[PDB]
Amino acid sequence: HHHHHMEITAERWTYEVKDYLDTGMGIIRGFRFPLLFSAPPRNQIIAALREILKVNDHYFGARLAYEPNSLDGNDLEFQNTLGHDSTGRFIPYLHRGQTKEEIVLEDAKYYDSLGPEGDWYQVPKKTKSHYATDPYYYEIKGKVKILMMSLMVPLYVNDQFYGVAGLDYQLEELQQRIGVKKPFQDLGYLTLISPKGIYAVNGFDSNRVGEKISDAKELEYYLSKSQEGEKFTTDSDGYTHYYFPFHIGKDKRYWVMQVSIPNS
Amino acid sequence: HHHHHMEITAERWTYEVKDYLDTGMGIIRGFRFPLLFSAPPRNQIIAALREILKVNDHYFGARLAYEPNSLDGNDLEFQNTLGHDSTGRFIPYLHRGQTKEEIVLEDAKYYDSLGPEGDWYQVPKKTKSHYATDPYYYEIKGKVKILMMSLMVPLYVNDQFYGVAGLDYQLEELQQRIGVKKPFQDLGYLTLISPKGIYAVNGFDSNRVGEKISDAKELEYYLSKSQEGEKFTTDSDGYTHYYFPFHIGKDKRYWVMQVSIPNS
Ligand SMILES: [Cl-]
Ligand SMILES: [Cl-]
Numbered sequence: 212h213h214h215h216h217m218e219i220t221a222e223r224w225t226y227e228v229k230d231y232l233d234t235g236m237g238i239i240r241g242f243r244f245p246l247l248f249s250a251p252p253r254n255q256i257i258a259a260l261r262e263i264l265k266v267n268d269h270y271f272g273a274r275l276a277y278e279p280n281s282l283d284g285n286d287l288e289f290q291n292t293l294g295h296d297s298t299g300r301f302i303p304y305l306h307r308g309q310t311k312e313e314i315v316l317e318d319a320k321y322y323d324s325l326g327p328e329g330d331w332y333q334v335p336k337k338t339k340s341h342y343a344t345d346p347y348y349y350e351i352k353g354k355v356k357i358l359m360m361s362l363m364v365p366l367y368v369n370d371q372f373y374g375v376a377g378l379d380y381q382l383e384e385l386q387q388r389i390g391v392k393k394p395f396q397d398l399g400y401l402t403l404i405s406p407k408g409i410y411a412v413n414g415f416d417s418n419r420v421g422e423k424i425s426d427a428k429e430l431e432y433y434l435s436k437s438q439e440g441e442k443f444t445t446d447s448d449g450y451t452h453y454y455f456p457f458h459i460g461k462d463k464r465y466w467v468m469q470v471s472i473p474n475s
Numbered sequence: 476h477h478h479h480h481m482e483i484t485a486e487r488w489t490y491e492v493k494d495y496l497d498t499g500m501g502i503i504r505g506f507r508f509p510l511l512f513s514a515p516p517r518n519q520i521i522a523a524l525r526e527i528l529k530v531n532d533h534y535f536g537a538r539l540a541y542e543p544n545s546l547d548g549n550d551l552e553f554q555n556t557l558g559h560d561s562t563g564r565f566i567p568y569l570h571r572g573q574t575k576e577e578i579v580l581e582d583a584k585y586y587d588s589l590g591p592e593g594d595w596y597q598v599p600k601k602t603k604s605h606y607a608t609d610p611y612y613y614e615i616k617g618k619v620k621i622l623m624m625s626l627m628v629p630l631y632v633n634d635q636f637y638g639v640a641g642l643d644y645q646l647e648e649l650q651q652r653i654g655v656k657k658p659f660q661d662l663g664y665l666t667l668i669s670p671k672g673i674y675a676v677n678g679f680d681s682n683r684v685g686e687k688i689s690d691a692k693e694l695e696y697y698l699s700k701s702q703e704g705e706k707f708t709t710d711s712d713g714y715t716h717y718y719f720p721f722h723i724g725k726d727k728r729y730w731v732m733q734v735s736i737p738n739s
Contacts, residue, residue, distance in 0.1 A: 212476035219483045226490035233494055234724075237501020242508055244523040251513035259508040262632065368526065460498075 220395050221453035221470035222442075228389060228403060228468055229457050235270060236343065236362045236460035238263065239378040246275075246376070247368040250283045253301055257294060260305045261314050263378070271359060271381035272306035276319045276332055277366070277374035294318055306351060306379070317352050335365040335375045343459040343466070345405040346382055346421045358382045358421045360411055362459065382411055382420050390414045394470050399450075402469035408433050415471065437467045449473055484659050485717035485734035486706075492653060492667060492732055493721050499534060500607065500626045500724035502527065503642040510539075510640070511632040514547045517565055521558060524569045525578050527642070535623060535645035536570035540583045540596055541630070541638035558582055570615060570643070581616050599629040599639045607723040607730070609669040610646055610685045622646045622685045624675055626723065646675055646684050654678045658734050663714075666733035672697050679735065701731045713737055 242263070246256070260273040279300055280286050286299030294303035294316055302319040322332035327347045334342045342363045348356040359379045366373040385403070390412035392401055400414030408430050413419040424430040436443050437456055445452045451472050456465035506527070510520070524537040543564055544550050550563030558567035558580055566583040586596035591611045598606045606627045612620040623643045630637040649667070654676035656665055664678030672694050677683040688694040700707050701720055709716045715736050720729035 212480065216476065216479045216483060219480060219487055223483055223487040223490060226487060226494055230490055230494035230497055233498045234501045237498045238505035241502035241505030241527070244506055244526050245509040245513070245515065245520065247526055248519040248522040249509070249513070249515035251509065251515065255512040256509065258512040262508050262511055263505070 217395060217451065217470075217472050218453060220472075221455060221468070224392075224394050224401060224470050225455040225457055225468040228401075229459070231389070232343070232362070232459045232466075235378050235380065236341070236462075238267070239273075239362050239376055240341070240364050240460060243364050243366055243376050246366060247373075253282070253289065253294070253303075256301075257303045257305070257316060260303055261316075264305055264307065264314050268311055269380070269384070270378050271357065271384065272304060272361075272377075272379035274302075274304045274319050274331070274361070274377045274379070275374065276300070276302040276322050278372065281366075281373040301374075306357075307381075315352060320350060331361045331363050331377055332375055335363050336372055339365055339367050339372060340463065341365070341461045343462050343464070345407045346409050346411050348421070349379075360385075360405070385412050386417055386420055390417060390420070395472050398475075399470065399472040402471065404433065404437070404454075404467040404469060406437065406464040406466060408437075411466075433467070437465050440465050481659060481715065481734075481736050482717060484736075485719060485732070488656075488658050488665060488734050489719040489721055489732040492665075493723070495653070496607070496626070496723045496730075499642050499644065500605070500726075502531070503537075503626050503640055504605070504628050504724060507628050507630055507640050510630060511637075517546070517553065517558070517567075520565075521567045521569070521580060524567055525580075528569055528571065528578050532575055533644070533648070534642050535621065535648065536568060536625075536641075536643035538566075538568045538583050538595070538625070538641045538643070539638065540564070540566040540586050542636065545630075545637040565638075570621075571645075579616060584614060595625045595627050595641055596639055599627050600636055603629055603631050603636060604727065605629070605725045607726050607728070609671045610673050610675050612685070613643075624649075624669070649676050650681055650684055654681060654684070659736050662739075663734065663736040666735065668697065668701070668718075668731040668733060670701065670728040670730060672701075675730075697731070701729050704729050 263273045282301045289295045289299040291297055304317050304319040305314055308315040321328040330344045344361045346360050348358050350356050359381050361377045361379045363375050363377040365375055394401055403412040408424045410419045424433055440456045443454050453470040455468045527537045546565045553559045553563040555561055568581050568583040569578055572579040585592040594608045608625045610624050612622050614620050623645050625641045625643045627639050627641040629639055658665055667676040672688045674683045688697055704720045707718050717734040719732045
């Protein structure tokens with residue numbers, strides 16, 4: 212009877228976390244639709260991105276990046292201005308500043324990188340799929356690196372790719388909202404693992420956030436089981452562990468909610 | 476021990492249904508942001524609304540309705556055209572046709588009604604709040620009434636109201652996706668109750684969908700307890716009932732997930 216209680220508890224936490232991530236993914240999904248058919252003035256699009264953050268303090272950043280000349284054919288006019296590259300690609304990034312009330316505009320970085328910090332642009336471009344990135348470090352103004360995950364949709368219509376839109380979670384925030392919750396009678400801990408095996412949240416050791424599963428055999432085990440999509444369980448010293456794969460939005464990769472309960 | 480198992484089961488179903496409703500509410504929340512700062516050509520906005528339904532078969536309809544001349548000051552030019560009233564208010568309603576693949580455009584009805592069929596426009600206008608309507612019947616082309624609930628956001632910016640955007644669920648669809656799920660070991664039933672006590676889903680008797688709780692004392696009890704926001708339970712002949720109040724998006728009204736489990 213105690214096992215039933217713990218297992219359904221793990222499933223309840225999985226849907227609570229899925230709800231939270233799906234809400235953010237839903238917002239950025241809906242945001243793209245006017246931009247699949249219209250090209251407003253660039254300043255008004257920046258104001259729209261800024262407004263998401265003004266009225267939603269869950270989120271750290273809101274980003275848009277277009278292919279060359281894909282918004283309005285007018286990149287040359289905006290070369291080397293803020294929110295633009297040296298060719299005038301429209302790449303606004305809005306994010307939290309020194310206070311939450313402060314919202315900063317800068318150029319989106321790394322859309323041309325094959326490193327993990329480019330995944331937010333490159334994976335939607337190559338796969339044409341909605342995509343929650345694995346955790347990555349993103350450098351903002353001030354030489355500060357922000358550990359985050361980004362919920363991305365491609366600007367994809369009439370079988371053509373035009374760019375991406377994205378909403379960011381700072382992982383320090385997710386750790387405080389989820390990572391510190393006790394799953395079962397004020398005991399146990401929660402972990403959220405990305406499809407590549409990187410902790411987005413870790414209630415056992417917060418220093419592991421943004422790190423890969425450290426043991427080679429455990430990482431290999433995780434990678435095999437997680438993308439099969441079925442719930443699984445392991446036992447360690449002290450704990451029973453429940454692993455529930457789930458999707459964010461229409462992204463077909465599996466994230467995993469780990470719920471760990473003491474044997475006592 | 477059996478009680479713990481049933482109660483956490485009820486909470487797990489509450490978050491699964493909340494996730495589903497929050498995803499749709501998130502989409503329409505995100506959709507509004509470009510329209511808080513830009514006024515694209517009306518035909519492109521209709522194409523954006525149509526596209527939501529093209530790529531999301533969960534949803535029955537997508538609607539936008541502006542205050543007089545609030546989109547572009549050009550209502551007179553569109554008088555008595557489709558998606559417009561006789562004054563040329565921009566009121567496009569896109570919804571499923573004779574097949575799911577068919578998407579129909581007509582004028583949004585009842586934005587000036589003080590009856591329940593006007594709530595989708597009137598309540599966001601008067602309260603300036605995001606709002607999931609109670610279930611209501613909406614008449615489409617062909618003299619067919621569609622029982623639905625609508626997830627609404629106001630077009631609200633700079634302390635001014637400009638209109639609303641909304642995403643509709645057909646309740647017949649919700650009944651098939653949720654209403655028929657068995658909550659506990661293939662036994663029991665689920666019910667989703669609106670803040671005014673109207674069934675959106677009813678796994679005990681599908682004929683009650685769109686109806687108010689029929690017993691006067693039970694309805695009065697429901698209305699008092701549901702908006703206090705705390706979980707509660709009742710016993711009937713055969714069943715233990717669990718009632719979990721929850722919010723959809725940023726709407727402060729409480730919906731209630733009812734999970735009913737046989738005493739056996
Ligand atoms: Cl979508
Ligand atoms: Cl919002």
